[PDB]
Amino acid sequence: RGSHMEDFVRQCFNPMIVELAEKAMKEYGEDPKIETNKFAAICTHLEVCFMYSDGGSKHRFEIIEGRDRIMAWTVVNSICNTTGVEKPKFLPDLYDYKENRFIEIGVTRREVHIYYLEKANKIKSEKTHIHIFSFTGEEMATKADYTLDEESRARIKTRLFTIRQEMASRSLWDSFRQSE
Numbered sequence: 001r002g003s004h005m006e007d008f009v010r011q012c013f014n015p016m017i018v019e020l021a022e023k024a025m026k027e028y029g030e031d032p033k034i035e036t037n038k039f040a041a042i043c044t045h046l047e048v049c050f051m052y053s054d055g056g057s058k059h060r061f062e063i064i065e066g067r068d069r070i071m072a073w074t075v076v077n078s079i080c081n082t083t084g085v086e087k088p089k090f091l092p093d094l095y096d097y098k099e100n101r102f103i104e105i106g107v108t109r110r111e112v113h114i115y116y117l118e119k120a121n122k123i124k125s126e127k128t129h130i131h132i133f134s135f136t137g138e139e140m141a142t143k144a145d146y147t148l149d150e151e152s153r154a155r156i157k158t159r160l161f162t163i164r165q166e167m168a169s170r171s172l173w174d175s176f177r178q179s180e
């Protein structure tokens with residue numbers, strides 16, 4: 001049962017991203033062959049995380065997402081004991097060595113306001129920073145602190161709208177937007 005959305009994900013994202021997304025999905029007991037919309041969402045969120053960490057200086061960001069869930073925690077306690085930051089209940093996506101906070105990245109196909117609220121009520125941990133990106137170019141960050149400069153964020157927004165267009169050109173966008 002091979003879908004069009006699966007082969008599009010394989011062609012749209014680089015192999016290191018696809019491989020990390022694949023291992024992550026099966027690690028949590030889900031199949032990219034059938035949960036193909038979610039497959040696209042993880043690859044997208046993963047690519048945004050990597051683009052984000054490339055937006056700062058050389059070694060400003062520590063990347064948590066994409067790691068195996070045990071090692072992703074391992075680096076968190078190391079960070080927590082090193083900087084004295086509260087250990088989050090949820091696994092965050094990044095750590096900003098410059099701002100000394102964990103970051104949760106969000107990528108949404110719906111309204112940016114509502115998704116932040118959902119992510120804020122679920123986190124309930126005031127320490128971690130929250131940064132939401134939309135497939136139409138809206139971004140929302142905790143305390144209106146968007147961490148990176150405009151150029152790095154604009155690059156992420158541009159790629160998101162390219163992913164949207166490519167899905168739409170293949171009639172897969174409507175299914176993707178309704179799946180979230």
Ligand SMILES: O=C(NC1Cc2ccccc2C1)c1nc([C@@H]2CCCN2C(=O)CSc2ccccc2Cl)[nH]c(=O)c1O
Nearest residue numbers: 024025028038041042045046065091092093104105106107
């Ligand atoms: O880290 C996350 N989930 C863990 C657990 C897990 C499970 C499967 C595969 C991978 C992972 C890692 C994580 N989850 C989410 C979303 C909403 C909250 C639950 N959720 C999902 O389970 C859906 S999948 C997804 C969808 C969109 C973007 C990114 C992802 Cl992964 N949104 C994030 O921004 C995030 O970082």
Ligand SMILES: [Mn+2]
Nearest residue numbers: 065091092093
């Ligand atoms: Mn995550």
Ligand SMILES: [Mn+2]
Nearest residue numbers: 093104105106
């Ligand atoms: Mn995230």
